[PDB]
């Protein structure tokens, strides 16, 4: 029973009993039906002239043009309907409503701001938005399917040699399903074809043996073959080749694909349409000067502290340009300073990316001789704005709370700008007024500001090979700067050369700019490290973005998408080259754009980057197109799932699970849940379509916080060949950013081992965080925990007898070797990264013999750092249960090849990762500011530096590794299987 108090425009009201399922059509009809009985009915105009408006639950007076939308999902405030005349068009208003619903907060807040940077970014990003939109329509209708269904191919057309021998003389047996004409029936043809074949001659051969005209499709989901690539380059084909599976493909009609694919249109919003010589900054001759006027109020006691002060200093990234300058300690009762502050830095020596990092610290004398300090709040100010003007004049800055687990006085790597809240400690600033506007000099002043061989090059290459966080000395810095003109032959040395220069100068910074402007392009992985917080210069980041534009491919872009999203926070200004490149790539690839949207959507609970990401979702949702419907459906499903969880996680702690199951099923009898949970693409993979929602296998388990198990029938026409049921665990209350990072690193390590020539394959399943401690986990069918395996088995031979009776015969040895290879891969991975300890439940074993780990926590040994002790821990200890399988139950391992093969494959994996460790160093360096407790600074990356033994050479790294994995195993791991020299 819902009572809605309507508000007629002529001054009367009505208390009407409104049905739950009734829409606004019936509301308006029965409203005007009884209007005639009421007085003054003649004044009413036609229904068209009047449109209902109200205030929503999310605190905004949002127009209601969606006349056909139901009453339940109106997200309304206190029930009342207001009648006004229309004051604009309808299409853009519906678009804005949908965009605001997708993002989470309405676009009205984005429109009602006074900051010129936000408005300029909103006005200027639409240029690249419309450019990408017209680019996607250049090859219509082919380009429409190109955008909607982009090929999932690999970067290089060349096939690795170690798997070419797995084929039947470099050829693939291919099965091609096809509908005859009256539908139904099972008609199968199978064809034999090589690997470097192209789909047009594939369909040509299929047609010519049957007796731009047809298209392929992977059976079960929506994957299509469009572009001129070798058939083996596609991920599905490669996966089937690795798995030894027959690749099931079906033949469709291109006209049907073009017909079912909807049109795309981009509409320009209404806000889209809405001399002097000056003196350069390098002519001012005066030190930088700051005045701290007062702090409005701080949250500190009187009888627990004595005196406070402000700890401030100039920075460039994380490297201070000068020593920290303090103020006189005033009492905390009256935070008034009025003290001018001088720095040992001149104005012309200020770099473009300079910052002003400040914090409020409390000093406690104590009875101890040394005094301690404790920050109250922190705040960062850019000394320049987006228009390249030095900040000046009166300014008030709001201060952020100190992050948990951070004890350093300042927070130089943090978001620049004021806290949006007004109930926060506000510090008063003041800058020197130069009686004009001081602007950073243009490119000409830098360009013509400047200009005012021995065989001992092995040192340059030697320091190039070392990791970005390796030990670097001022002798090395002087050598690097002296021979910078000879560094062109080794483009690897660019990050080290950048770190060699000190940024509190002018002439050498100009020389560095001249060098970078002519730098040869480098590898995308080598230029991706130039995007972390250690390189804040706009020219360096522009060069890195140019390298990514030139050389990075879509597969690798989807590989490193999460870190690329992460390094958007380190950008000081809203409009920059990186975000333009990311938006151009997300608007030409629906698969990339989907994950882009979901990553940014997850990263808005943090208010530090809420606005700069909300604007991104706004722009993309304006320019994405027809994908808004699927995104809205996914968002509705996810938010209803969040409601379903949090109505039970906190309110039903003290009851039994039976009442919880009754509660869950009685809401699963409410038609709204079924109505919303149908026919929407899975956020984990847009290629999957989720059909009906069964209830016979959707429940909760006995875990710590009752994750939700959900199953969806596959609605594909020939879904029988592939997986029949899609299972997803909806986990609430556990952060999944660390799990996503762990699975990503596992995926790169698996790719590295496969490319190297080892079958050290793992199972990097799908994870996706969708917000605050909420995310989706893709679960694997026909997999069991070792705990329940040994529970049903029973003692030490239970897993061995399980692998015996599950697949006996000639396939037993295949199961054994697959188990060995997976176990070796996960041993190496869990040792190197440092994931928390493994249990019986954490290890998951497949039916065919593969094993994998499902539960991940902290990765850089964060949980065991409570007690200070420098040591290396091996979580994945090989219990005797696994050694039975590795040695096939042998009494002695001294006359079996399996033990030495396992040893050498582990050593080869370790050497491969130690050779490719630069990628992992760069990834954990780029993922620093995510806010994880386990990854807050470079001291955490020191752990991954010392587990791989970067400082030790390749010789004693082996001995260190065996020491770790034998004193963790209580011995048993000795000597070398073959002596090379």
């Amino acid at each position: 029973r819902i009572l809605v108090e309507c508000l007629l425009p002529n001054g009367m009201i009505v208390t009407l009993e409104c049905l739950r399922e009734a829409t606004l059509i019936t509301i308006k009809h029965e409203l005007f039906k009884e209007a005639r009985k009421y007085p003054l009915h003649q004044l009413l105009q036609d229904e068209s002239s009047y449109i209902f408006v109200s205030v929503t639950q999310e605190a905004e007076r949002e127009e209601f043009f969606d006349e056909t939308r139901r009453l339940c999902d109106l997200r309304l405030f206190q029930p009342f309907l207001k009648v006004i005349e229309p004051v604009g068009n309808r299409e853009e208003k519906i678009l804005n409503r949908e965009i605001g619903f997708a993002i989470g907060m309405p676009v009205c807040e984005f429109d009602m701001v006074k900051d010129p940077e936000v408005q300029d970014f909103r006005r200027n990003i639409l240029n690249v938005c419309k450019e990408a939109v017209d680019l996607r329509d250049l090859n219509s209708p082919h380009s429409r399917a190109m955008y909607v269904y982009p090929p999932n191919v690999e970067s290089s057309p060349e096939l690795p040699k170690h798997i070419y021998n797995k084929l039947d003389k470099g050829q693939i047996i291919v099965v091609i399903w096809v509908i005859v004409s009256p539908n139904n029936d099972k008609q199968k043809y199978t064809l034999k074809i090589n690997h470097d074949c192209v789909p047009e001659q594939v369909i040509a051969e299929a047609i010519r043996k049957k007796t731009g005209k047809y298209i392929l499709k992977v059976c079960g989901c929506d994957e299509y073959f469009l572009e001129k690539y070798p058939l083996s380059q596609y991920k599905y084909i490669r996966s089937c080749i690795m798995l030894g599976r027959m690749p099931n493909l079906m033949l469709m009609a291109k006209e049907s694909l073009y017909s079912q694919l909807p049109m795309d249109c981009f509409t320009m919003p209404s806000y889209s349409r809405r001399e002097t010589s000056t003196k350069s900054l390098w002519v001012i001759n005066s030190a930088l000067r700051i005045k701290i006027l007062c702090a409005t109020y701080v949250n500190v006691n009187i009888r627990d502290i004595d005196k406070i002060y402000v700890r401030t200093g100039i920075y460039h990234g994380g490297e201070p340009l000068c020593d920290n300058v303090n103020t006189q300690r005033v009492p905390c009762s009256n935070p008034r300073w009025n003290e001018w502050l001088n720095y040992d830095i001149y104005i012309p020596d200020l770099p473009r990316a300079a910052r002003l990092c400040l914090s409020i610290c409390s000093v406690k004398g104590r009875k101890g001789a040394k005094e301690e300090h404790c920050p109250l709040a922190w705040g960062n100010i850019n000394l320049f704005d987006y228009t390249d003007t030095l900040v000046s004049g009166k300014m008030a800055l709001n201060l952020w709370p100190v992050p948990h687990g951070l004890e350093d006085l300042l927070n130089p790597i943090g978001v620049t700008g004021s806290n949006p809240n007004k109930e926060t400690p506000c510090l008063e600033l003041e800058f020197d007024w130069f009686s004009s506007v001081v602007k950073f000099p243009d490119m000409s002043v830098i360009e013509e500001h400047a200009n005012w061989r021995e065989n001992d090059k092995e040192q340059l290459k030697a320091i190039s090979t070392r990791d970005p966080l390796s030990e670097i000395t001022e002798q090395e810095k002087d050598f690097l700067w002296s021979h910078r003109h000879y560094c062109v032959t080794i483009p690897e040395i660019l990050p080290k050369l950048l770190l060699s220069v000190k940024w509190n100068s002018r002439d050498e910074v100009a020389q560095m700019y001249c060098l970078v402007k002519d730098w040869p392009p480098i590898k995308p992985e080598q230029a991706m490290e130039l995007l972390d917080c250690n390189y804040p210069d706009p020219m360096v980041r522009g060069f890195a973005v140019r390298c990514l534009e030139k050389y990075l491919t879509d597969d690798k872009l989807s590989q490193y998408l999460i870190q690329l999203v992460q390094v958007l926070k380190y950008e000081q200004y809203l409009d920059n080259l990186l975000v333009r490149f990311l938006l151009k790539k997300a608007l030409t690839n629906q698969r990339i754009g989907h994950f882009f949207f979901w990553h940014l959507k997850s990263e808005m609970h943090n208010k530090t980057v809420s606005q700069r990401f909300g604007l991104l979702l706004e722009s993309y949702c304006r320019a994405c197109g027809m994908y808004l419907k699927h995104l809205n459906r996914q968002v509705e499903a996810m938010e209803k799932l969040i409601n379903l969880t949090d109505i039970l996680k906190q309110e039903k702690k003290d009851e039994t699970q039976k009442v919880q199951m009754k509660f869950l099923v009685e809401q699963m009898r409410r038609p709204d849940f079924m109505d919303a949970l149908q026919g929407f693409l899975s956020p984990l993979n847009p290629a999957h379509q989720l059909g009906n929602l069964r209830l016979e296998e959707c429940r909760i388990m006995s875990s710590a916080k009752r994750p939700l198990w959900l199953n969806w029938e596959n609605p594909d026409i020939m879904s029988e060949l592939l997986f029949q049921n899609n299972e997803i665990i909806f986990k609430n209350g556990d952060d999944l950013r660390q799990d996503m990072l762990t699975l990503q690193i596992i995926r790169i390590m698996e790719n590295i081992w496969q490319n190297q020539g080892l079958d050290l394959r793992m199972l990097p399943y799908g994870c996706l965080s969708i917000g605050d401690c909420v995310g989706l986990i893709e679960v694997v069918r026909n997999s069991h925990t070792i705990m329940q395996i040994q529970c049903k088995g029973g003692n030490s031979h239970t897993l061995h007898q399980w692998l015996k009776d599950k697949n006996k015969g000639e396939i037993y040895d295949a199961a054994i070797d697959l188990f060995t290879r997976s176990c070796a891969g996960y041993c190496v991975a869990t040792f190197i990264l440092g994931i928390g300890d493994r249990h019986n439940s954490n290890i998951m074993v497949k039916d065919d013999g593969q094993l994998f780990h499902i539960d991940f926590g902290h990765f850089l040994d964060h949980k065991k750092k409570k007690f200070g002790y420098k040591r290396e821990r091996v979580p994945f200890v090989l219990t005797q249960d696994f050694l039975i399988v590795i040695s096939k139950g042998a009494q002695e391992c001294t006359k079996t090849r399996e033990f030495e093969r396992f040893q050498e494959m582990c050593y080869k994996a370790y050497l491969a990762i130690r050779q490719h460790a630069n990628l992992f160093i760069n990834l954990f360096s780029m993922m620093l500011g995510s806010g994880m407790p386990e990854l807050q600074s470079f001291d955490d990356i020191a752990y991954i530096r010392k587990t791989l033994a970067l400082d030790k050479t390749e010789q004693e790294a082996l001995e260190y590794f065996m020491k770790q994995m034998n004193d963790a195993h209580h011995g048993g791991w000795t000597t070398k299987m073959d002596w090379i020299f």
Partner: protein
């Protein structure tokens, strides 16, 4: 002084990596320095670190031909010789950019002499651990409370904005109906129908009652908002009060653990048994 050995030298340090150097050389005065063995583990190489210009530097010491020195040519037969030479002489002639002396050496002797029966110190450290863990549990629980309370502050903030918007839309409706109703009441009062006039008083009374109800709701919600903001400020004050003693106990526990480690007794394999 004299030619006292390298092992007992104040500035020299043992098996030391970057993170503890940064821990000791954090927010210290200019010129502060120490010497530790190089991470390359080459025999008798050593590296000199000093905090000049606000950031930690890393001077390398060369050991070519059994002689020490910063660069070719080497002119010191021992590390102590050039350490004292550059302590008593500025580095201006060596490098035009770098101009600093080795003023304040980092010495462990202070922490060695201010620390001051094995069972007694073992139980003292156990009690320190218990106090640290209970204080950290209180810190975590109250930090969760602080974050949650901020969430409810935001929630009633949005509630106040929605109530305010409703108030403005209702007052705008009242103003519009007053402006567009004064030009039709003349005919109504000339014809004189009591029923419709009674209806207009009844409707205006109901509307004003609803306005009063929503105004009361807004006032009580803003009272709840301000009292919860006061509680939030009190929680923040408690945070700032309990941070520094927590970190001081953390340093004390680390110092005791390092003293126990350098004493050579392995307490990790016995304390856990309890």
């Amino acid at each position: 002084n004299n030619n006292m050995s390298l092992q007992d030298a104040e500035w020299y340090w043992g098996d030391i990596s970057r993170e503890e150097v940064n821990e000791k050389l954090r927010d210290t005065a200019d010129g502060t320095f120490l010497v530790r063995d190089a991470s390359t583990k080459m025999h008798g190489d050593y590296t000199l670190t000093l905090r000049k210009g606000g950031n930690n530097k890393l001077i390398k010491i060369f050991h070519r031909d059994g002689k020490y020195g910063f660069s070719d040519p080497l002119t010191f037969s021992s590390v102590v010789e050039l350490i004292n030479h550059y302590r008593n002489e500025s580095l201006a002639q060596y490098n035009p950019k770098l101009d600093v002396k080795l003023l304040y050496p980092v010495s462990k002797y202070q922490q060695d002499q201010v620390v001051k029966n094995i069972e007694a110190v073992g139980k003292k450290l156990h009690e320190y651990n218990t106090q640290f863990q209970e204080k950290s549990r209180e810190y975590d629980r109250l930090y969760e409370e602080y974050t949650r309370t901020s969430q409810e502050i935001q929630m009633k903030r949005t509630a106040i904005e929605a109530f305010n918007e409703t108030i403005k839309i209702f007052e705008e409706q009242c103003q519009t109906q007053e402006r567009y109703s004064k030009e039709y009441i003349e005919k109504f009062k000339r014809e004189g129908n009591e029923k419709e006039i009674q209806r207009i008083m009844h409707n205006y009374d109901k509307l004003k009652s609803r306005i009063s109800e929503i105004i009361d709701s807004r006032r009580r919600l803003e009272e709840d908002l301000k009292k919860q903001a006061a509680e939030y400020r009190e929680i923040d004050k408690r945070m700032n009060s309990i941070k520094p003693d927590l970190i001081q106990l953390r340093k004390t526990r680390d110092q005791y653990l390092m003293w126990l480690t350098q004493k050579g007794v392995r307490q990790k394999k016995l304390n856990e048994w309890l």
